[model samples]
Target chain A: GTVTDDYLANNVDYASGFKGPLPMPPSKHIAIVACMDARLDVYRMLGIKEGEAHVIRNAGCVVTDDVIRSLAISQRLLGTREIILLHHTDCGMLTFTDDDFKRAIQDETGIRPTWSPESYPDAVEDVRQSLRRIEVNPFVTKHTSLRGFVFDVATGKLNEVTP
Target chain B: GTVTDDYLANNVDYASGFKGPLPMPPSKHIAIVACMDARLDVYRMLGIKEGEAHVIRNAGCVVTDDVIRSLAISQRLLGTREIILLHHTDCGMLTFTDDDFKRAIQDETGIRPTWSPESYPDAVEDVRQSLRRIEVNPFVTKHTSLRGFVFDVATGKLNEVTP
Candidate 1:
């Protein structure tokens, strides 16, 4: 169900070991940054089969310290030059109503309310903000392309949120 | 469009969080071991909406050293108790003939072939073999429960492939 590689830009060329029931051409990998929320299946929406993309998840699908670090390696080591930043509605990372999150985080990690809304608003807004963060992320290739999308939690639809 | 804990054999308390727009509550966490082929999208078929499952992908969807190590952490830390093993038709990981894999692994890691049927035999057989390995894995809990499934790469339909 995956979009064909001819549709992929700057496609890489490599040969598979040519074994099993299926033979594969090396993929010009695309990495996806998605929420840890299981409801949004970025795979199905993209119609990607196996061996096509690399997916990374974090709370809110936010590109945190570790995500940036990992994305750096993904590009450097895993051949990812394109990125799909995915966020979805009603994410648990988006839920918790701020006060609820603060209480929960405090309860779980014993960390006091040291963070604030100006920095981490809601989840959708967080994704929009992260789009900018990824653009300048030192680890990401300076020319790496990014597309941000929000999948409707209730409707099973995906909407491109950023250009 | 999400399934409720009450709908399944186990129930997770999501009632308190069900009143919102998305109200995506993570009541149960399922751990999925699927092939690395890009064709597999476990979310859409299962009708997941938010962050409800932890998907771990690897070549062959086979339980290997890394699978066992990571699954141990997923079980202990991620609160996942059920394991769903998925292998798909047209899996590129299975494309390499056994001799091809043997040569490549020997060239890359200096390791020799240690497994049987050298070739997977077929997608269904691969799924069943993975189930057996997961069942006898000493590091994995015998009670954790293992279920096997095969996805038609051409059709996107998933069926129970194991008893």
Candidate 2:
């Protein structure tokens, strides 16, 4: 059986204990944007419960239009008001430049993507930049608190990024 | 303390037992596209540990260009061979039309978003649609398995979407 099958088996155990149907909106009134890094369990790291926060993750946790869209929806449609941005150490985004990554895909696939790869040289600055994007975006102006952080892979600690 | 401050306090506890850095690539070699819903704890639900899988989530688990970017990096750089798409029963995207969402945001903010809100009418159909978007994208061709599922928010069961 495939890993997906194994996951389904695991899900059976999970469902046996499941008592959910959590409300549609976040209970903590918060949203988190974090890197798609496998090592960072956004919920576990932040100690947030299942029904407490909206989590939007991507390649590098870069604040693209999609993140803005999610944040807008989270704030406007849902009731979330606080926003968190988390980037981590040793990220794939730190390894390669956007130009090199995009060119490799364009060369292999024959179709260059129009969107920016959104790689960052440094995770700390990326968090700051991401915070700025959210601050400047008009749609997500409803956030009461906007903060950024860089998670340390070794220490499992979130280091606040001062902007 | 603010909720953000409270989360930082939670982080102090998380970091107390921190382990050494795990490898950058996902050990399980799988990537999941899931909704940014607050209730779906992607890791706990799948019973996957940290450093195992890459999770890409957004407002509705919609397949936008940003998702394609992340998947390309995951498959090409991180060695993930399997892909999973998870939409859930009680999705905010199911609450409104793209036209209406976009219009409302425009009416309030006075800045019409250049991007789509990407709302869908159905959950099961949305899973299938998101699956096809990845299948047709040129950058993410390395996956050996691709499947879609609608996670039951009430029962916590992953209902497979046959495509």
Candidate 3:
């Protein structure tokens, strides 16, 4: 039995702690684009509660087309005005490049990826690029308050990136 | 003087409680692709502790190219083998068609979206479609245990979607 099976039986036992329905729109009107790193717990680290904001996560949190798409919905439909891009240190993305990674996966699976992993040499500059991408994307609502941070995996500190 | 400022001041206050040095790869060998809905806390809902699983989220948890990209890394680079696609009820995505949503956004922001919102009629079928997308994607690790569930926004229950 996998964790799914275990969750099927016991999830309700845990979810029972949750009280009646939170609102449809987030209370704080914020959305966070962050890396999918296991060490970065966006909610606890940012001091955000359950229904406060939308947390959009991917591999490097590098502001992809889908991220902009989600932010469009987050801001246009759901009323989230603030955006936070949270990249992190000690990230696995720093280990490989688009060409080498694609070649390796192609060798292993015989399928070349159409999408690039968007890996970068410097994590700090990566965060800067992501912030720039978000700032320039027209789909993201205008005047949307945006910021970027790097979560230090070693020390669990979020270092702000000033634009 | 935005949420970034507030986070800068208070995030450390919250982050100090973290007891880290967690592993880079997920300990539980699982990855969850779920919606960026604020109310559905993936960790609390799944009874997962920190560093246990990869939680990849977007607007509706649609299995886009980036989702597959992230999953490939999760399985190939990281040690995760199981995949869970978790969608939810009353998603804002269900409220409008792609054309309507795009038109409304264009009306508001004067920029037409290049990508579809991937909105669907039913949440269950949406989960089914996402699961199908993942199951067929060659990038996802072969023989991976895959499942889909729709979390009830009103009841806080996860209803398994059968193909």
* Candidate number with greatest lDDT: 2
* Selected candidate, larger TM-score, 2 vs 3: 2
Candidate 2 lDDT, tens digit per residue, A40-79?
Answer: 9888797999889999999999898999999999999998
Candidate 3 or 2, higher DockQ: 2
Q: A1-163 in candidate 3: lDDT tens per residue? A: 9876775666788668766588889788889998887877788777777777898999877788889889888988889889888998888788989899899889988879889888888889988898888777888854357888889887778887886
Show the lowest summed lDDT stretch of 10 residues, model 3 chain A: A6-15
Query: Compared with the true structure, what per-residue lDDT tens digits does model 3 show for residues B62-138?
Result: 89888888888888889788888899988888887899998988887788888888888899997888888887778
Q: Which parts of model 3 have CA positions greater than 4 angstroms off?
A: none
Give, for candidate 1 chain B, the lowest lDDT window spanning 10 residues: B2-11
DockQ scores of all models, one per candidate: 0.09, 0.86, 0.69
lDDT per residue (tens digit) for residues B1-163 in model 1: 1111111111112322322344343335456666544444455445444455666554456665445544543553455677777777765445446566446545654654344212465888878887787776654562346777776655555566764
- Residue B4's lDDT within candidate 2 is 91
Candidate 2 docks with a DockQ of: 0.86
iRMS value of model 3?
1.6
Q: Can you write out model 1's per-residue Cα lDDT over A57-90, one digit (the tens) per residue?
A: 5445666544554454455434567777777766
- What digit string (tens of lDDT, one per residue) describes model 2 on residues B83-126? 98999997999888888888888889787888999998899997
Predictions ranked by TM-score, top down? 2, 3, 1
- Over 4 Å off, model 1: A1-28, A97-120, B1-23, B31-52, B56-163
Which prediction has more favorable lDDT, 1 or 2?
Answer: 2
Pairing residues by index, what is the TM-score of model 2?
0.98
Best by DockQ, which number? Answer: 2
